């Protein structure tokens, strides 16, 4: 019983961690790259 | 019993119900 | 990187030996010696499988 419970909990916890940090890294890269490309466009026009 | 103790591994204090 | 690490970051981790009460059994096989053992056995089994096919 402890084997089945611990394996279920490990699968759910690893899936939740992977999903959350994929979201976080994607949002950070999206916002930072958007501002970087806007600044490169505003700098190349000068 | 066993899963509840595995959840409350480190849980201190409880309601002491003398009635 | 490689300049963002101290010398204590670079310092090697030593390998433990066989216990002295058990040194008569030979050397304590770690990952390197195990890799050598597994390479030799996989090579010999590959030759034997080809000989059995032939």
């Amino acid at each position: 019983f402890i084997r089945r419970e611990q394996l279920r909990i490990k699968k759910e916890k690893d899936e939740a961690y992977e999903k959350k940090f994929k979201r976080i890294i994607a949002e950070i890269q999206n916002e930072e790259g958007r501002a970087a490309n806007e600044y490169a466009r505003e700098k190349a026009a000068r | 019993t066993i899963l509840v103790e595995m959840q409350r591994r480190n849980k201190v204090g409880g309601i002491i119900d003398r009635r | 990187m490689s300049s963002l690490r101290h010398a204590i970051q670079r310092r090697a981790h030593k390998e433990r030996a066989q216990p002295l009460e058990r040194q008569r059994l030979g050397i304590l096989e770690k990952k390197k010696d195990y890799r050598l053992r597994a390479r030799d056995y996989k090579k010999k089994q590959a030759v034997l499988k080809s000989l059995r096919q032939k």
Binding site: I9 | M6, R9, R18, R19 | -
Partner: protein, 389 residues
């Protein structure tokens, strides 16, 4: 054992303030007068069980007579996966027994004002036979809809944002056979834990009550009941307001264990008047008697009359949500926060809360005229345990 209280009035307020301030209490002489059922009530002992479940290191001790408890509080951890549950997203189960007469907002109001001061999230799930999600005749408890859209915006005022509060019902229920019983399960998920609540200021006059929105719910009766209730409430409030809009909700019946039975047959209404100025809302509720069978138009007229009473009476916050906003104002930072109560709003429960705060160690309140402005000095405790990363 150190601090000493008497009586069964404002019992949950005393235990919750004891948990939040960390002061060990001893409440003596619960029911000295009652010879038939002396000692603790079943809803009180179930609130003790829930408090032990969500806290950690708290020691509760009920005596042999049941008429004296003592309580040394611990930290409000919540649902940590090492002590309370198995996973961090797992709902801590709490069962309350079939001999429970008070509504579930009797458990939710202290838990919701004790929940922003926790370490991890709170994911409590109230199941069991005696979980009534309605208003009670009882001590006139709020409903779940009244509780939600009348008092959780006050946490939104304090800066505990309601973007992360998840109070959801999965079955709904009224009392049923007599006052005892229930069946409808809920789960509340506080994911918004703050260090210190903001010192808010309710001072400007909340004059123009712009609109009325509400919820009329029916569990176990015909679904024309809420339509008749809406026509009654609109017939009362159409003299005053052009936009009253009341949702209709219907659930078939909840089943409890004895072999299951269907219990919790009833219907009720809950009006919320929103003032155009700020987070100022007046709420009123009315539920059918659990054995009576009264007219739904009588219930709609009764809740509309109670709503117009609270609109006439209240300064800024109604007296049902006044203890919650006042104790959060006391938990805030070491500045003054200014609430605008009506002179008719001041109640013995509010006065008893003032006595309990003065006994615990918070500062007194300053009452001046403007309805009266009550000004509260925060004590600057906040939450004790939070992983500052």
């Amino acid at each position: 054992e150190f601090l000493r209280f008497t009586g069964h009035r404002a019992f949950t307020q005393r235990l919750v303030l004891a948990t939040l301030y960390g002061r060990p209490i001893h409440i003596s002489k619960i029911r000295s007068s009652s010879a038939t059922n002396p000692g603790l009530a079943p809803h009180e002992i179930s609130f003790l069980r829930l408090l032990e479940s969500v806290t950690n290191g708290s020691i509760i001790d009920v005596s042999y007579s049941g008429t004296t408890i003592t309580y040394q509080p611990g930290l409000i951890t919540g649902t940590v996966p090492g002590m309370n549950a198995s996973l961090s997203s797992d709902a801590i189960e709490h069962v309350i027994p079939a001999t429970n007469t008070r509504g579930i907002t009797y458990f939710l109001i202290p838990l919701a004002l004790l929940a922003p001061f926790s370490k991890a999230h709170l994911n409590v799930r109230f199941t069991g036979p005696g979980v009534i999600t309605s208003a009670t005749h009882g001590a006139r408890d709020l409903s779940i809809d009244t509780f939600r859209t009348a008092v959780l915006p006050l946490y939104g005022l304090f800066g505990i944002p309601p973007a992360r509060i998840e109070l959801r019902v999965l079955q709904r229920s009224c009392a049923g056979p007599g006052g005892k019983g229930g069946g409808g399960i809920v789960e509340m998920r506080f994911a918004s834990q703050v260090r210190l609540p903001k010192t808010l200021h309710l001072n400007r006059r909340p004059g123009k009550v712009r609109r009325i929105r509400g919820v009329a719910y029916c569990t176990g009766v015909a679904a024309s009941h809420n339509n008749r209730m809406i026509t009654a409430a609109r017939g009362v409030l159409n003299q005053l307001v052009s936009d009253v809009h009341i949702a209709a909700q219907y659930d078939p019946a909840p089943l409890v264990a004895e072999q299951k039975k269907k219990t919790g047959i009833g219907f009720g209404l809950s009006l919320v008047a929103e003032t155009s100025a700020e987070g100022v809302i007046y709420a009123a509720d009315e539920v059918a008697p659990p054995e009576g069978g009264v007219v739904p138009e009588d219930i709609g007229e009764k809740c509309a009359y109670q709503l117009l009473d609270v609109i006439a009476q209240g300064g800024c916050v109604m007296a049902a949500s006044a203890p919650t906003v006042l104790t959060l104002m006391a938990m805030g930072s070491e500045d003054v926060g200014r609430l605008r109560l009506g002179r008719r709003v001041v109640s013995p429960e509010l006065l008893e809360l003032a006595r309990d705060l003065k006994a615990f160690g918070a500062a007194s309140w300053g009452i001046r005229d403007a309805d009266l402005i009550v000004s509260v000095k925060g004590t600057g405790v906040g939450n004790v345990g939070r992983k500052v990363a």
